[PDB]
Amino acid sequence: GAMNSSNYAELFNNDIKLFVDDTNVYRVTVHKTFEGNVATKAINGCIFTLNPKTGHLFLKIIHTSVWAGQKRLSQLAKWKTAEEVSALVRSLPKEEQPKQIIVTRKAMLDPLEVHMLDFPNIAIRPTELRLPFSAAMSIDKLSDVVMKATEPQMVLFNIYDDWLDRISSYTAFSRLTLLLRALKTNEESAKMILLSDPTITIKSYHLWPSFTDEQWITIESQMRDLILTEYGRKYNV
Amino acid sequence: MNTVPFTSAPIEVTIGIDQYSFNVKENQPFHGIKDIPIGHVHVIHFQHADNSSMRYGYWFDCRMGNFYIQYDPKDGLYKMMEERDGAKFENIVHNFKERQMMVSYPKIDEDDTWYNLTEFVQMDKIRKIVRKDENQFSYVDSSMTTVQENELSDPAHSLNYTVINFKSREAIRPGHEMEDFLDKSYYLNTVMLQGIFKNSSNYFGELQFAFLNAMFFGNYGSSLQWHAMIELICSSATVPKHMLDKLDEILYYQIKTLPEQYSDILLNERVWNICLYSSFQKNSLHNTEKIMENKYPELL
């Protein structure tokens, strides 16, 4: 059933699994028309499909052309997500196919189940975790490849950079969720924290800066502080 | 007008005959039911006074043979049997009628209720859902599971309703996932109507049979099947106009007959709310929507 705090270590075991987040698939700007009505303009989106054990990110870029002449786009976006995840699974060799797919939003369960009828042994699961994967588009290199896309494209990343050389998957996931939670709560402040010292850079082949173990502890502290500062505002507590 | 004689009534029992029911006392001189209308299936059903668990009964059609009920003290139930000797049977019935030891099927002349509940129900279709080929009548009870319930365990004692599953490869064409899941017309019209049932009359017959087993026996699997067959039509954007108009009549009579006190266990809130208020056919079931809103406004 549902993935929660109780069964959290399951993410880092040797059963291949993917998280699927559909929150950036259908993206719009809302604007006024000449006549003073409101209209939307779609911008490029992405499916965020992540192996939490390895850090392998299957970023399927959703080009605005897929919405052309379609109705009920927020409904279609879930089915298009399920179609592309299904296509990704079929594209993988059998020994690389997930045993479980965890959707971050319960509205993805039926679309994904129906698209995966051919894979009765792949479990489709919700989660009680509130995962900040919506903030993926605050990672500059992921935002840049999505916005520049002129056609549907899949791009492969490792969202953990080289962290697994030094830390476990559990710790890598905890760092990623803290970074994304900070970026989601106060993007400006989080990015300031990540780039304030110009001597620490992002390698061409990486998403995040090349922090030493001690620098990561400092950064992680600064992100926790950011999240608590922000929370003390939201709620006046 | 046909007769189902009883050898005797050795245990106190509530006897149902279609939508009617009568209490018989232990060793009461009761010898059966006469004036049963020819032209319809019928169901004769039992609930023992000393163990109200296991409602059970027999679907039959008096055109298909001479049937009687005899209590079996070993298996502890009233059994239907066929009498192959016409003249013995005629002589048994004539004697019990002369001694007025039979209840009369109590049909009001104006009253089309049973026809309306069984319009599409055929004994030959019942005998394919309920497999016991040596008998011309069919035993059903409260506890019998469906082929579908048994997949999710004695196959010989199962209700072989047509399996309907909205998240199945049968229901969903490769490449038409969203279309077929949100609009079940493919599944209704091609797979079920053209493919399996051959026509709307067979589909309605099974729907009506499922409802009557749900109502008369509290058969949970039958209730699931009745709701699945309603939902498959209501969830299809493309349904022939005659089928929608006929479904509205079918459901109206079903909702009219349902005991008011069983609405809580016999009606699925989600299915009925979806069918009447959100589905493609939300505005196609005028009679049904009106009786449901007046009789069961709580459920909705």
In A, minimum Cα distance to B180 occurs at: A114
Please give the Cα distance from A209 to A201 (Å, whole number).
5
Please report which helix (H) or strand (E) contains residue A203, including its range. none
Q: Are B67 and B36 in contact (CB under 8 A)?
A: no
Please give the Cα distance from B60 to B211 (Å, whole number).
17
Please report which helix (H) or strand (E) contains residue B111, including its range. none
Spatial CB neighbours of A110, under 8 Å, sequence gap ≥ 6: B167, B181
Judgement on whether residues B153 and B300 belong to the same structural domain of the protein = yes
Please give the Cα distance from A102 to A99 (Å, whole number).
10
Listing DSSP states for B240-291 in one string gives: -HHHHHHHHHHHHHHHHHS-GGGHHHHS-HHHHHIIIIISTTTTS-HHHHHH
Judgement on whether residues B92 and B128 belong to the same structural domain of the protein = yes
CA dihedral A124, A126, A129, A132 (to 10 degrees): 80
DSSP-derived letter for residue B122 is: -
Distance from CA of B287 to the nearest CA of A (A): 31
Helix axes B220-234, B200-217, angle to 10 degrees: 140
Judgement on whether residues B104 and B121 belong to the same structural domain of the protein = yes
CA B251-B255-B256 angle, 5° bins: 115
Residues of B in contact with A113 (CB under 8 A): 167
Q: Which of A156, A139, A125 is nearest to A51 (CA)?
A: A156
Calculate the alpha carbon distances from B173 to A88, A107, B184, B193, B199 in Å.
Answer: 19, 21, 11, 16, 21
Please give the Cα distance from B12 to B4 (Å, whole number).
18
User: In this structure, which topology does domain A9-163 adopt according to CATH?
Assistant: Nucleotidyltransferase; domain 5 (3.30.420)
Number of H helices, E strands in chain B: 12, 10
Judgement on whether residues B104 and B212 belong to the same structural domain of the protein = no
Please give the Cα distance from A129 to B287 (Å, whole number).
46
Q: What are phi and psi of B70, to 5 degrees?
A: -140, 130
Please give the Cα distance from A225 to B1 (Å, whole number).
88
Please give the Cα distance from B2 to B176 (Å, whole number).
53
CB-nearest to A117 from B167, B178, B182 is: B167
Please report which helix (H) or strand (E) contains residue A47, including its range. strand A45-50
CB-nearest to A110 from B168, B174, B181 is: B181
Report residue A152 CA to chain centroid gap: 18
User: Domain total for chain B?
Assistant: 2
Helix (H, G, I), strand (E, B) or coil at A49: strand
Q: Which two tokens stand for residue B286?
A: 């005028």
Judgement on whether residues B153 and B296 belong to the same structural domain of the protein = yes
The total number of residues written for chain A in this structure? 237
Q: Find where tokens 């709310």 sit.
A: B273
Resolution of the coordinates, Å: 1.5
Judgement on whether residues B150 and B192 belong to the same structural domain of the protein = yes
Calculate the alpha carbon distances from A116 to A89, A221, B235, B254 in Å.
Answer: 9, 41, 22, 38
Q: Are A138 and A182 in contact (CB under 8 A)?
A: no
Calculate the alpha carbon distances from B75 to B72, B78, B130, B145 in Å.
Answer: 6, 9, 20, 20
Judgement on whether residues B165 and B285 belong to the same structural domain of the protein = yes
CB contact under 8 A, B172 and A83: no
DSSP-derived letter for residue B131 is: -
Calculate the alpha carbon distances from A125 to A20, A112, B207, B234 in Å.
Answer: 10, 10, 33, 28
Looking at beta carbons, which pairs linking A229-235 to residues 24 or more positions away fall under 8 Å?
A229/A186, A230/A185, A230/A186, A230/A189, A231/A185
- Best mutation target among A72, A75, A90, A117 (most B Cβ atoms within 10 Å) is A117
Q: Which two tokens stand for residue A152?
A: 């549907």
Identity (one letter) of the amino acid at A96? E
Q: Tell me the CB-side half-sphere exposure of residue B27, using CA atoms within 13 A.
A: 0
Q: Which of A175, A163, A172 is nearest to A52 (CA)?
A: A172
Calculate the alpha carbon distances from B37 to A10, A207, B22, B42, B116 in Å.
Answer: 65, 81, 18, 9, 14
Q: Which residues does residue B46 pair with via DSSP β-bridges, in sequence order?
A: B15, B56
Q: What is the CATH number of the domain that holds B97?
A: 2.60.34.20
Burial class (CB in 10 A: 0-12, 13-18, 19+), A28: middle
Q: What is the CATH number of the domain that holds B298?
A: 1.25.40.550
CA B93-B94-B100 angle, 5° bins: 85
Residues of the domain holding B28: 1-143
Residues of B in contact with A118 (CB under 8 A): 169, 174
Q: Which two tokens stand for residue A98?
A: 């997930």
Please give the Cα distance from B239 to B228 (Å, whole number).
16
Q: Find where tokens 């005899």 sit.
A: B70
Residues of B in contact with A117 (CB under 8 A): 167-169, 172
Listing DSSP states for B11-58 in one string gives: S-EEEEETTEEEEE-TT----EEEEEPTTS-EEEEEEESS-----EEE
Superfamily of domain A164-237: Prp8 RNase H domain, fingers region (1.20.80.40)
Please give the Cα distance from B275 to B281 (Å, whole number).
7
Domain parsing of chain A, residue ranges: 9-163, 164-237
CA A95-A97-A99 angle, 5° bins: 105
Please give the Cα distance from B300 to B296 (Å, whole number).
7
Q: Which of B61, B54, B42, B58 is nearest to B107 (CA)?
A: B42
Q: Which residues does residue B20 pair with via DSSP β-bridges, in sequence order?
A: B17
* Helix locations, B140-199, DSSP H: 147-151, 177-182, 185
Q: Which residues does residue B103 pair with via DSSP β-bridges, in sequence order?
A: B33
Q: Which of B189, B182, B145, B185 is nearest to B167 (CA)?
A: B182
